[PDB]
Structures are given as structure tokens and as C-alpha cells.
Symmetry: D3
Subunit: 289 residues, 6 copies
């Protein structure tokens, strides 16, 4: 009769909570989720959530155990899983870098000698990076804590996943190359997409809408009509500022416009200097241009 979809959402780690929050904002929040449950209903009667570990999501989606998944690009690439990437989700960004003991000769990938050992949690991506750059080096897979590998003599070099070079400087390591830029993606099974594109695009519009709302707020203010002109030039908004009557002693209007977070501080000072008062910043859940 009517098709259901299952979306694979990380159960633990950094990706998990923001993925739950995004679905919530997309109108597809978790519904009546009992604990000890691997599956959960959502606010949409045709969408369920499967809690899966993040490294398994590429495969679950490739195989069709889940129609859609939310996971990291690094994991998708490492598995080499056969999946369609639908959207970049603009969170969970991290670089898989190649790093060396700061006192090392090696200052760039050109310096890596035949016998060099590299410790990694991502042997697939790392072998591939080495193969593409033609470097002959050995790759040792570790469970974690690659940062310790030079210290204990397992490796000359490491790979590592970071937003800030800080955990690297702390272990006295220097980035000598970036192997991969990673971000969280919404992915899809191909067979699922061809047969269930309505509901899929429905969730995709909801999610895509939340992403376009990022760093966008609705700014409202009361202005005396004599200054309404300078407020136009300051708040162009999406098509133009929305202007409404205010019941007061002066000819006061209320002006609303969607504004980006990059612009709000300079705008506030520019608005106040023109006679704007009662400046409100109201949240926007979804934008569809």
C-alpha cells in the first residue's frame, strides 16, 4: 500500500546527538522511544530509526538493512561501501591528517622513506593515500590512540582525526599533510531511493531545510517612521524587510528580516545608531528558499 523507511542513526559518539536534534528540527523527532530498543518510531508514521554504530552505517545502507543513514564521510570512504550521498549535514567536521614527531626530518610527504611505518585507524584511506602519492610505507592498524605509537616505537608516523591541531601539538606532533576532509553525510540505498523517492525526498526536504537555517535568525525591531529608510538599507533580508504598524504615540513601525549570524553584531550597532529599539532575535527552524 504505502512505503516505510528506516534511517540508520549513530547510537554513540559525537555524531549521535546532533543527528537526533536535526531529525527533531526536520519534523521527524524520535517518538515514544523505549530504552533497550534498537528501533524507534518517529513523529512521521512512515519513518523509523535504527540505532547503529557509526562505522556499520555505510554497510547497513549499502546492503539495504537501512534505506538511509547518517554517518561520517571518513567511515563511508574507509568501508568503500556502495551508497548514494544525498546531503552534507554541516556538522562533525574533522580532518584525517598525516602527522610526524615534531623533531623529525620528515616535514612533508616527499620525505617519507621506503621503510617508514604509519599507524592509523584508517588503513583503507591510508593505503590509498600512499598508493595515490606513490609512497612505499608500511601501514599498521591500531585500535586507537595512534598519538602514542611513536612514543612506544610502533610507528614513525601517525594519522589522526581533528578539528584543532591541539591534541597533536600536545603529543608534540606536526601535521605534514591532510589526507581527507570529513563531514557528516545523509546517505541512501540506491534500490530504496528508486522505489521510495517520495518519502525520501520528503525527509530530505525537511533535513535540507534545517541545514539552510543554520546561522540564520529572524531579527525584529521597533523603529520610528522617520528612520524607516536607513533600516531598509541595513536589513535587506531575503526579498526585503517586512514592515508592520505599531500602536504607540509616535508613527512607529516594526521591521522584521532574516539575517545571517555573521552580520548581527555589526547590524545591532548600525541599527541602534539609527534609532532602532527592542531588537529581537527569533529562532528559525527551517528555511526553504
Amino acid at each position: 500500500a504505502v512505503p516505510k523507511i528506516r534511517i540508520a542513526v549513530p547510537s554513540k559518539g559525537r555524531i549521535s546527538e546532533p543527528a537526533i536534534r536535526l531529525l527533531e528540527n526536520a519534523g521527524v523527532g524520535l517518538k515514544d522511544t523505549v530504552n533497550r530498543k534498537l528501533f524507534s518510531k518517529t513523529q512521521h508514521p512512515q519513518i523509523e530509526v535504527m540505532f547503529s554504530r557509526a562505522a556499520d552505517i555505510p554497510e547497513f545502507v549499502a546492503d539495504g538493512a537501512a534505506d538511509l543513514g547518517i554517518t561520517g564521510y571518513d567511515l563511508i570512504v574507509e568501508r568503500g561501501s556502495d551508497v548514494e550521498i544525498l546531503e552534507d549535514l554541516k556538522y562533525g567536521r574533522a580532518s584525517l591528517v598525516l602527522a610526524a614527531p615534531e623533531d623529525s626530518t620528515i616535514r612533508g610527504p616527499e620525505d617519507i622513506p621506503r621503510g617508514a611505518v604509519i599507524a592509523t585507524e584508517f588503513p583503507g584511506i591510508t593505503e590509498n593515500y600512499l598508493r595515490e602519492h606513490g609512497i612505499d610505507a608500511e601501514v599498521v592498524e591500531l585500535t586507537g590512540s595512534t598519538e602514542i605509537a611513536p612514543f612506544i616505537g610502533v610507528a614513525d608516523l601517525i594519522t589522526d582525526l581533528s578539528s584543532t591541531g591541539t591534541t597533536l601539538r600536545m603529543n608534540h606532533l606536526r601535521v605534514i599533510d591532510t589526507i581527507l576532509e570529513s563531514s557528516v553525510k545523509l546517505i541512501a540505498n540506491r534500490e530504496s531511493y528508486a522505489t521510495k523517492s517520495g518519502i525520501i525526498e520528503e525527509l530530505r526536504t525537511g533535513i535540507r531545510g534545517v541545514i539552510d537555517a543554520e546561522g540564520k535568525r529572524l531579527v525584529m525591531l521597533n523603529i520610528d517612521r522617520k528612520n524607516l529608510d536607513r533600516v531598509r538599507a541595513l536589513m535587506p533580508g531575503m526579498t526585503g524587510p517586512t514592515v508592520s504598524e505599531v500602536l504607540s504615540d509616535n508613527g512607529v513601525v516594526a521591521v522584521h528580516a532574516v539575517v545571517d549570524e555573521k552580520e548581527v553584531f555589526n547590524l545591532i550597532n548600525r541599527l541602534k545608531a539609527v534609532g532602532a529599539r527592542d531588537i529581537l532575535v527569533v529562532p528559525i527552524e527551517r528555511i526553504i528558499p
Copy 2:
């Protein structure tokens, strides 16, 4: 002089966090909550919160240790506590079902023989269900994990609490009846209500308001005036769409209406096809019709 109320809120489990979020949205968020504290102030000077385990809340409220409580209907029924139910809170929904090993003869309650053993966490509800259906069966109370009871030979049948039949299919069990539909309730002591109805109805209005806001968003768009008519028919809203001037090159208006989440996706496509742009979905915390 002036009356204080104490509301019992679950401390752990699935009910806990959403109850805290609901009070927050009702204007009664937790205020300055020190850890290791069994009590907490709220944003309202006359409302305090007592952190109680969910199964104890019916009794705390029945006895008057708490004026009000937020807990599950199953727990209220199981205890048979003497309390007034004020509101259904529309979350934490779950069915207490009667289930059998999938390969069993028993396909419905009619098939249960004299000597049948049923394992449960809810002996009260279960005895009562059996008594009302006239079935002679034995009831064994377990601490948890009733799903394992047939496997280890303790029981022929089990009861279980689920939103999805998934944890049941996983243990190879089939639902042969639904015993009780459960949902989270706001409850009240009777003596508390008669003597403190002002503040109680105040919290009740706040909470009731958050529940009516569920699946309701405020949708805003910019439309060229030539198409303002088709937007009326698409966005009836609560009384009618709110229309405001936009300062642009064309006669553009801005149109706002409260819309239900069931309708937003079809609405978006219907709006875009009519010339609507810059579609915003803004959250609504409380609705009072």
C-alpha cells in the same frame, strides 16, 4: 499567605528528560538545580520539583507528598493509587502486550489453558486482565527481562512494554493481545487541587499549551501580490493568514500562518509552484486556542 506546589518528576528512565523539557517550555523550567538535590526550585516562585522514581510517583501524589506528578499510566494503574488525572502528555506511549513463543499453539487469549504461566513486571494489571477475561493462568512476577522467561522455562507467556514489536520479534515472540495502552499523564492529589486550584490550573494551562503546540509550526513566506489569492487557499491557518507589507521592487507581501507538520511538505511544493519564496518555519512554544 500564598500556596506552594510540589511536582513529582521522574529522576531516571525515558519519562524523565521530556518531562523536564515540557516544564521548561511551559515557563516552569528547573531553576538553580544543585546536584545531589532531591528537590529543585523552578522559574515560578510557587512551584518546586521533587525528583522521584517513576513507580513511586502515583503513591507520592495519592498521599500528598507531592501535589502533582508526571508519570506513566501503566504505573498509575499498577499501583491502583488514588489520584486525579489532569492531562495526557502525549509522549512515552507504549503497549503492555501479552506475547507467546512464536511457534506456540496459543494464537489468542482464548487458547490459554488452566495451568499456563505468565511472566510479567505488572502482576496487578495482569491478574486483573486475566480476571476480567475469566482466564485461569498463573502469574509470575519478574524483576525484568520477561523476554527470556520462555527460553529458561519459567513461563509459557510473557507481558511486555513496547512501541514497536521489534524486541518481541527478535526474541521470536508474537503479540497475542494488548492488555493496556499507556501514555504519560499529569496527575494531582485531590486535597491539593481543592485547596490550590489557582496555581495548579496555572501550571496546567502552561503545560496544556505546550501539548497543543505539538506538530504546529509558524510558516512565513514572501509572495508577489498577484499570487496572494492562491496563498490564502493554501494557508488557512487558525483564523486566516496574516499578511504584511514587504519593502521591495515589486508589490511583495509577507504571509504567516500556523500550520500542522502533516501538511508542511505538500504545502511547500504547493507554495513554491505559486511563486512563494523564502519559506520559513518558526517554532511555536505554546498555543492557547
Copy 3:
């Protein structure tokens, strides 16, 4: 070229999460925060977050390891750290009280004898309180659980941090004085402020804006024009209610005003009695008057 700032934010305890939420609401939410990271980027390219324990934040800020910090006033005072207080953050309020075994002679600080022992987690503040009140009493520093100290014979009196006297009454203790009122503060290094005041005031405006939004919501309603006058007197708002056209059968207008949470319940009943319908309470993230 351009200056970066580092803000010290508590990593564990009651202060932590609300501090993260406040920055989020200020437009400076945590960005791409990898776990096991002591530092994190934020939504602002010039602002980073250092996760620090709350008692260490005064010193980190005094010394310049962090430009700014969010921590409790009690901790700032106890350390006696040299820092500039920028804003009170209006959460995490607690009183450091002096308390005695309820059956004790001591009913006020005047009754404390020469040899009296006071157990505390705040010896600095406590010595200082004693020194200012001229009382000769001994101060014993404990790791925690000062509430047990009279019971085991370590102390006659204790200090304690509470929003509610409940944890004190439970251990059968009575407050005999308040030593210090504590609240969460935004603080700053002096050298950081003189050299990086632009970006600092930018974050300060963002944060200050979120604090002024507390207990303030945007209330919207549909009213028939014949009753628009009584709605003026009920919703003065910031300058005056914003009034917009509604496309319906009657001359209906829509009226919006910023209202304080203290007034919403009485307002709702007053609005309904005048013919107001479809009352919406919409959240406001930031107010800049």
C-alpha cells in the same frame, strides 16, 4: 592580523551544560567538537572553547591561559583570583550558608564560642567571614559531604551550598547565617580585554542579549477589530503591540507583543475574555533593548 579569544567553560558539574547552551543561543555554539578534545572551535571563527574544571577557571583567566571564563562567583572569590567580572549569567545560584545541628544552642553567629570547629569546602571565604565578624573559630577543610561532619564528631558547624534548605533539614541542620550569595559569572583577563575588546564585546553583546531574553516570549493572537482597543491596554509590549491584517470573513487583525513570563497566565485569561483567539507563545533567543 586579527585576534582570537579562548573562553574557559566548565567541563563537568551543574554550570557546564547551561554555559554550553548559552553560547549556543549567543551565536557561539560549539563547532565540530571531537571527543577527547580539551579545546573546541565554535560557530565564530575567532572564538575557541577550553574545557576546564570550574575551580580552575578563575586562575586560568587571571593568568591569561584563557581570555574569558564562565564559572561560579564562590570559586572566583575562594581563589581570590585577579579577574574582571563582565556579566552575571543569572543561573547556578546558590547560597554558601553557615549551619548548625538543629538541636544546638547556637542560633546565630553571635553564639559561636572560642573553640568552635567549622567544616567547609570553602576555607578562604569561611576564614574571611570569621575574620570580618571577629569570631574565633577553627576551620576544617573537607573534600565534601560537610553535612556528615557533626554526625562523626569532626565539626560543631558546617558551611554548605544550596538553593533549597532541604538537604540541610534532611541532615537535621538549621541555617544560622548566609556567608555568600553565589551566581555564575562571565569573567575576563584584564590584559586580554585591553588588547581584544572588539571581539570580547561582540561575545558579551551576544551573551548579554540571551540573558535579557530570559522570561521574555513573543505573544501573538488573532482579534476581531471591534476589540483591538482592549488588547492595546493588555499588551503594551516594548514600545507598543504590532498589529497586522488577517485575511478572513471579519475585520480580524493579528497582534504581537513581547511579554514577560510573570504576566502570561493572567494575560491569557484577560485576552480570552476580550475575544482573543489562537494565542501563540513564540520563543525569543536574544533581546537587545
Copy 4:
């Protein structure tokens, strides 16, 4: 052919780790546990089922487990038809009836009609009022009965203590003892009559461990001329064991079973009589 037995063991709480340690000491330790739900042991005929202690009385009576290890309080609360085989001499606790210290009630006889008692053991409590002829309500809590008076849920509580210190902190006074609890080894009656051999083998091991508690083997070197005075000082189970030591003098080695209670005084006595090199060596099991 070969009867196998299942023993229900607590999976969490304070009964768990000591019960597991008890089986280990009895020669039937957890073998290659992948803790879990079912574990193998050193004995081919014995398997452990990890269970919630409150459920163990039921699992045993219904036959899902041949044997169990759980608290007497839980056995009585369930009302489960099980055979108590052995007292395990640990997890002792009294289920007491308690009143607020500022209460007039000092004993069962002071409890007025309609008093409310908060408890985790509603079956035990209702029965206690019916054996004593007291007309009072019973209210069941998940835990923290200590806090019920303070919040106004009950006038009285029951609680489970071995030291009255939790009660003393929360300003509560013991007015009676309802039941004395200790961890028991229990048996399914049908399992016993059909598998007595293997049950008795584990029973003996388990009983041997309990009978070794606080017992030590004391060993010392002494010159031959003082051997007569050691004799009196430590009688042991039957008498002290003697062996020749190879050294310069006529040194002998003397060993005996001694109780912890005796050891300090005994050491002093032995030292004053010329004994040196005194060893205390553990005994896992004793069978008299």
C-alpha cells in the same frame, strides 16, 4: 547418565561477587565466561545462571534453576517453596521497623491505628502486623524508605541494616526487628531427590568454605627443648603437627589450625616461649 545442575547466582548487588568468590573457593569457579547470562564452571556437571537476586527464589521453586544463592529476606518475601540447604554466613542484615527519633513510638505496641509504614518488603510487613495484631497501612517504595517520613509518605519505615548508622543519620530509631537476613544456598525439592549426588558434592565444597572462615594454619620454628609448652599454647583441631628442621640446633617445626580470634594472644605466647619464624597460611576449606 550424568546429571547436570543449574545454579542461579546474583548478577548485581552485594550478593554477587562474594557468591562468585564462594564458588571459586569451593572448586567450582566460573570457567571461560564470555558477567553473562549462562556460564560454565570447573565442574562439567555445573552451570551458573546469572539472575536478579529477587527472582532467584522463583527460578528455584519453579525449576528453572536447581539451586540458587540469594538473601533470606528475598526468599521469605517471595514466599517461594524452596529448600534452604546451607547458611552462607555473609550479607547479614536485619529488616528493622523504625520511627523518626522525635516520635513517641518506641515499640510495636505504640503503633496507633492507621499508621503508614513505607517498605520495600510489603509481604513481610503485612504479615508482621498480622502476627502482632497491629492495624496499620503499608506503602511500597522502590527504595529510600529513610526519606519517607521527611517527605510525609509514612509515619514509619522498614529498613535493612547491619549497622544502625544510616538510621542514625536520618534521625530514625529502631523499634523492633522484623526478620534477620543472611544469604542462603537454596534448592528445588524435585532437583534434590533426583540429583542428590552432585548437589551434595557442591554443598560440601560450599560448606567447607564457610567452615574455613576465620581459620588459619599457623606454623613456627622452635628448639626441641621448648616443644612441651607449644603443645598447651595451641591445641589445634586435634593437636599440633611436628616435623624435624635441618639447622644447627635441635630445631623442630610445629603447625596447627588456629582461629583469627586467638592469633594475636597466641603469637605473644609463642614468642615468649622461644618460637620464631611464625607463618599464617590460608585455609580454603575445612571438613571436620
Copy 5:
């Protein structure tokens, strides 16, 4: 001068605490651990590096650790060039191939072309299909292979069990055994040829502990006139030890090494022959 050795020990999982207990029993316990990443032991020449069990085979082969303690399954999965020194007789588990119970597949020979097997050991599995000549896909999971058929990720799973009970719960049937696992003590080849003395010293300690498992010293008092029948009843490692007891009769004390398996029957035999005061005393290490 003085060679020092590093032994990689699992920092979490079920291999961890028993390995640490094993070193303690071998006279090389963790000393003043501030557990950590590197710890001192009772032996000046020995230091522990806490490591993830999956990494230990690599740390050992590459030379970052002279010795390790990790599962055979992990050693084979890594394919690490290490020397297995000793079997440690714990953490036994079979890596089995399993099918849904409602599956037609009962054996390796029933596996149809293109069947999908979910596993945590993709190297072991791929090799198993290549030693048996089976054309099937392999899919690697982080864990919970038991759930893969139910969700439709695979037709078959591998799993690691000592009791088939997890499999029985999730309605799965064992169709073959791929590998039998046990915890091993492993060595770097270069470390052995250069530090054999200290390695063999720890090896002996460790081997002595394993050879003591399930062995006890049984001790009893008996009258001299029955000493002949004890002899037959417990042969011990060579024969029972006898010493004079000081009491009233002609009482002697008799001691022997006995296996746990024997102890119950033996106790009965000894009791029927007049032996009393029977003690079971632990043995930490045995070296024949």
C-alpha cells in the same frame, strides 16, 4: 647488563583482570600502579604495558613489547609474526559459523554461492572460505553479529562463544567451528634470542600457575592404626606426607596434592577410614 622486558597486557575486556591475577600469582604482580599505560611489577626486570588486546599481536611482532597476553583469535586475525610460548588455559571460546535456526543450511557444504556472512573476524572468515572452497561474501561488523540476519545484513554469521546460549536465544544454529580460541602468552622472536633468561623466568612462573589450577593440598589428622588405608586413598604427586601429631592417642598428620575432581569422593573415603580435621589449602604454583 640487566635486560628489562615489556609485557603487553589487555587494559579492558575479559582478558584483562585474569591476566593481571595471573602475573600476581606468578610472583610478578603490579607494583605501585598510579590501570595506567605503563606499570612496574615486583620484578625489577619486568614492566607492564597496558594495551588493547587486538593490538597486542602487533606490539609484540614489531618489538614495542617483548611479550604479550592476548587471545589466539586476535593473534591469527592480525596474522602477526609472533612466538606462542604458553597456553594460559582461560578465555576459551570457539569462533563458530552460524545460521538462522529456520535455515536449510546445516553445514559448510550447504552454503550457496554469494551468501553473505557477517563477522568481526573478516581475515579468519575469508581464509576459512578459501580453505574449504566456498564462494561467499564477507561483511565486517563492529559487534552484534547475532542481529545481522534479523535486520537482513547477512544470511550467516560468525560468533565467539563457549556456551551456545547467545546463539540459542537469537535462534541461531552452529553449522561449523572455524577456530578454537584460548588466551596465549606470546613473544617477539628477537626478544627471545636476546633475553631468554628473564623470559624463561616469567614463563616458568606463569606455567607454574596454570599447572596449579584445580590442584589442592589436602591435609588430615588420623590415628596411627589407619595410616595404611589413607595411603591407597590418596596417591598424591609421589605419595602422602606423614608427620607426628601431639595429642592423647597415636595421631598422625597426612598431606597430599589432590585434584578438585577427586576431592569429594576422597573426603568420603577418608571419613569412612577415620580421618578427621580435613583441610583444603591453596597451591599457587606447581613445578613437576
Copy 6:
């Protein structure tokens, strides 16, 4: 009548479980603990109060606890007026003064005026600068002093290590040792003069455990004709114990106290001299 004593024991950290194990080995283990705040022990006259290790020095000096078990570093930091009774030979750690590896400072004498030292032991540090005559600031942190230079909070740190490995990871170099720490048994002076009997009884038990560390009872079977060479090979505490074995030849059993350090060499010696069936049996306590 009957004096009772309270002993403050750490409730968490690395001092906790070994202290509890120490009391158990001393014949005064935790009895029926419902861990808690107050526990009973095997001794009627002894009760345990679980406490934070940092508070134990105060609880003892002020008299809330007669005895305690806590780190020397914490005792000195408090400046608490307590009697140290016994060294407990575990939880050893040095409080070191450390500099960034890329620092010019190699010793105390290199520390320039106004240098900032981050520490968890501000009392110990301030005193160290005043015993050495160094003009430097002290900044107190909750923990993670290792990270203070990297973030720019201090030029120097103090830290508490037994292996310099945490320091080596965070690129820090030890420049001096401020204090050497070990876990102590401490006493209230007033408690000692009034309850010396019971205190000394626990002291002896506790001291007996520490003196047993690394000591074992070695036992072996040998033919009578080789008994002379065993004598030389293991002198024991006074000399080896000998008993007749019942077998076919003239076999005797020989036992002695031996140190862990000796055991490997000794085993080899005994094997070469014809000794077989070598047992290592634990000793809980030794009193010379």
C-alpha cells in the same frame, strides 16, 4: 570494658581496594557491608569508616577516627598531627618537580625569580621553596598539572609518579624530587594511649601481611639420598622442614620459606638435584 576502634579507609582512588585487601589478609576483613560509610569487620572491636583519602589525616588527628590508611603525601600536605605507625609498602610515588623538556632549567638552582609552579600540593611546594630558598609563585590546580605549561599557566609543575612515563609523554623532565610517598597506617595519639592493646593487635596483623609480601612456602619431594644438597640450596627462615613420604623408595618431603627473587634459580637447582613435585603455597602473614 571493651574498647572499640574506628579506622578511616579510603572510599575511592588507588589506595582503596588494596587497603581493604590488606585488612582482609590481616584477619579484619569487611563483614556484611551493606562500599558504605561505616562497615563492621571480623573483629568485634573494629569498625571501618570509609573516607576520602585527603580527609583521613584530619579525621585521625581530630579524633573522629582512631586510625587511618592514607598516603604520606596527603598526611604532610594536611600538616595533620598524627602518629605514623607502619609503612604499608604500596602506593609508592614520588612528588617530583618537573620542567618542559625544551627548558633550560635542569635543577632547583636554575629556577629564576617569579617562576610559576602548578601543583596539587601547594603546602608541600611552598615549603620546598622555603627550605631551598627559591623565590617562585605557586598556583594550585584540581589536576592535570602536566598540561599547565602547554596552556601557559605555569613554567614548572609538580607531579606524582612512580614511572616517569606520563612526564615523558608530555615532554617534561624531572629536575628534583620534593617528597617520596608511600601509604601509611596512622594513629590518633590519644587513641593510642587509651587503646594500645587493640591497636597493637591490628598493627601486628597488618605488619605481618607486609612482611609476607614476596615470600612463599616452597615444598618438594626428594629421595632420601639427596636430602643433604637441598639443605644448602634453600636455607629458609631457620632451616628446611623434613617429613617422611609414603611411596616405594625412601622419599622425603622438604618445605621452606623462600623469597620470590630466589624461586626461579632455586627451582633449577632443586631440579638438578633430583627434587620433583615442587609446590608454591601462599603465606598471608609472617611474624619473625
